[PDB]
């Protein structure tokens, strides 16, 4: 999957 | 939210 | 912060709050590295798959601050950025491996007792301090929760580096050399986590042979915000400290 | 320049003051 910012 | 900044202090 | 507390006063001197002009809102920590260079994650500034790519002039940064919101007179400073500096490499289509950026400042900041710049380490203090079960502190004015959601002023949570093979199994993300992952175990029973506006905040840690501060990490990202069996990746600041230099070098 | 004072907090270690968390890391570090 992607990565997801916080 | 956020207070104002004032303009003289940037 | 999720499950942190407040934090004391004077606690984190190179807090940086990076603020958009209009909506005036909290975009992301950051941290003051000098008089004039703020260091934050690239994604902060530029990550097209929410169509963000801040420039210059939509931004200010706040230094010495303590509570989110009130205009902190007589005790934060607010300056404008010269310049953004995003690394090259930066992989925002992926996994956000190496996500780190400058900010040259138009002016330079003078020190206080609320502002006062962390140190960067050497080889010697990440080999030394960056192992697995030791703690680092993680500082912002982000979510208290996934979803009071928002904290009055700024929130400390001190959290354990965790073994890489740990980090690996937590997520379907490639994990590379250039990320850690702090964050407690299920069984570990203590909570905190990054959430939020926390992003391009500092990971610190105080080495026990010189008493300083130094700047381990940057909160890049995770899954949720303190799920238990996830942890926050932090950007490893050292492994990407010959671009730091290089940038300074010719830029300052 | 700044360098020389890095991580030395004027309301902490400059005036050998402890903040209420730090010792958790002192103690983590084996």
Not at chain 3, 117 to 128: G, K, W, Y
Not at chain 3, 166 to 189: H, L
Not at chain 3, 236 to 250: E, P
Request: charged letters at 30%.
């Amino acid at each position: 999957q992607t990565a997801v910012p916080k | 939210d956020f207070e104002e900044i004032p303009s003289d202090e940037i | 912060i999720v499950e942190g507390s407040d934090a004391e006063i004077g606690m984190s001197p190179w807090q940086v709050m990076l603020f958009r002009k209009s909506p005036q809102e909290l975009l992301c920590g950051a941290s003051l590295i000098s008089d004039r260079w703020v260091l934050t994650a690239a994604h902060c500034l530029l990550y097209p798959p929410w169509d963000k790519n801040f420039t210059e002039n939509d931004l200010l940064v706040r230094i010495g601050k303590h509570s989110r919101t009130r205009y902190e007179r007589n005790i934060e400073k607010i300056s404008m950025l010269e310049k953004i500096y995003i690394h090259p490499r930066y992989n925002w289509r992926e996994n956000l491996d190496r996500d780190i950026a400058l900010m040259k400042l138009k002016k330079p900041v003078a020190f206080s007792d609320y502002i006062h710049p962390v140190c960067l380490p050497d080889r010697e203090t990440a080999a030394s301090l960056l192992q697995a079960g030791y703690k680092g502190r993680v500082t912002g004015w982000g979510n208290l929760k996934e979803t009071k959601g928002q904290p009055s002023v700024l929130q400390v949570v001190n959290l354990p580096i965790v073994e890489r093979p740990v980090c690996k199994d937590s997520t379907r993300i490639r994990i590379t050399d250039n990320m850690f992952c702090a964050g407690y175990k299920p069984d570990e029973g203590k909570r905190g986590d990054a959430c939020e506006g926390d992003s391009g905040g500092p990971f610190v840690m105080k080495s026990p042979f010189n008493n300083r501060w130094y700047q381990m990490g940057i909160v890049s990202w995770g899954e949720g915000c303190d799920r238990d069996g996830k942890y926050g990746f932090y950007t490893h600041v050292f492994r990407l400290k010959k671009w730091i230099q290089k940038v300074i070098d010719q830029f300052g | 320049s700044g360098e020389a004072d890095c991580g030395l907090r004027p309301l902490f270690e400059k005036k050998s003051l402890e903040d209420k968390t730090e010792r958790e890391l002192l103690e983590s570090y084996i």
